[PDB]
Amino acid sequence: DRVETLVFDGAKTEARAIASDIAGSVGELAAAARTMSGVLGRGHAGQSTDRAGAINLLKANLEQHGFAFGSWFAEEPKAYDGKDVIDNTERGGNADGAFTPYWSKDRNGNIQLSTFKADYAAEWYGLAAKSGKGAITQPYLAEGTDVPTTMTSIAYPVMSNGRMIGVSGVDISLAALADRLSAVKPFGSGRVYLLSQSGKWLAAPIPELLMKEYDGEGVESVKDALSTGTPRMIENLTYDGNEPFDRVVYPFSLPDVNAQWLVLVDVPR
Ligand SMILES: C[N+]1(C)CCC[C@H]1C(=O)O
Numbered sequence: 001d002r003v004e005t006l007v008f009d010g011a012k013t014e015a016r017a018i019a020s021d022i023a024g025s026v027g028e029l030a031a032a033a034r035t036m037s038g039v040l041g042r043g044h045a046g047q048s049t050d051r052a053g054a055i056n057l058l059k060a061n062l063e064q065h066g067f068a069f070g071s072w073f074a075e076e077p078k079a080y081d082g083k084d085v086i087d088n089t090e091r092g093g094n095a096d097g098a099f100t101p102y103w104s105k106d107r108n109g110n111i112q113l114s115t116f117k118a119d120y121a122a123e124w125y126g127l128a129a130k131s132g133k134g135a136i137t138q139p140y141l142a143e144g145t146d147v148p149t150t151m152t153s154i155a156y157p158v159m160s161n162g163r164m165i166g167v168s169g170v171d172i173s174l175a176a177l178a179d180r181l182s183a184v185k186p187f188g189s190g191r192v193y194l195l196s197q198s199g200k201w202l203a204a205p206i207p208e209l210l211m212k213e214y215d216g217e218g219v220e221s222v223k224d225a226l227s228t229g230t231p232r233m234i235e236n237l238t239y240d241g242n243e244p245f246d247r248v249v250y251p252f253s254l255p256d257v258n259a260q261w262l263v264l265v266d267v268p269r
Helices: 002-045 051-058 060-064 123-131 174-183 219-228
Strands: 070-075 101-105 111-115 140-142 149-160 163-173 191-195 201-203 232-239 243-254 259-268
Touching: 002 051, 002 060, 002 149, 002 163, 002 174, 002 191, 002 232, 002 243, 002 259, 051 060, 051 070, 051 101, 060 070, 060 101, 070 149, 123 149, 123 163, 149 174, 163 174, 174 191, 174 201, 219 232, 219 243, 219 259
Parallel strands: none
Antiparallel strands: 070 101, 070 163, 101 111, 140 149, 149 163, 191 201, 191 259, 232 243, 243 259
16 A cells, blocks of 8 residues: 555654664663673773772763663672672672672662672573673563662673673663653654564553563564564554554664664554
8 A cells, every 4th residue: 555655664764763773872881881891800800990999980881871770780609809798788798698789870860879689590690691792681670779660781791811700781771761762753643662672562652561572463573573673564453443553663683782672663544
């Protein structure tokens, strides 16, 4: 159809715009995470930074990049400095007794020093540690944040003389993503959303959908778009009665973290 084709093109053109903005923001944070992983690693190799200073330096990633919700480092057990660590949040000690510093934002938009559990099998640690390369997580509810907040994490292995000593990473709150999708505008009576590597909701119509897997109308096309990496269009779906619209899905590779996301662009009839 010449109408549906034009809707498909216009939505594609705008999804292309949205994807390069998200991909750019992501790639820039990934670079800041990888840099931090380096200075934490080299600072360990040459005893240029103690455990106290590692916390000092870790705050730089939030002061310089507003799009990062938090900056953290989970240390392989006893790896950093081997000192006793039980419960000293000002020195990166969790209840488990492990070096886990965490700078994050609180409810009022200020920076606080938190601490988290060393869940080595968790995506934010396992992915980067098993591949040896930078990685990005499926959306998950963060623990060490002041207020519970749903975020995705870009994590990199921290190396010290050819042996890894832990994982450092940066966070993108699911709200920050939602904000960007309104800073660069929707279709005008058009809404844009965002799916994760596996089709989980990163930016959704209602917040109840976040972190859940897509199973609305046109689900198979989402799975097929995710495979081919090419765009699909779900025709005529209804948030019921009121105005029906088309759902265009637009995969796009994220720069350094070995993953792709879907832009969803909703255009009403
Ligand atoms: C500290 N983090 C933001 C990063 C790793 C775990 C996560 C958290 O649970 O808070």
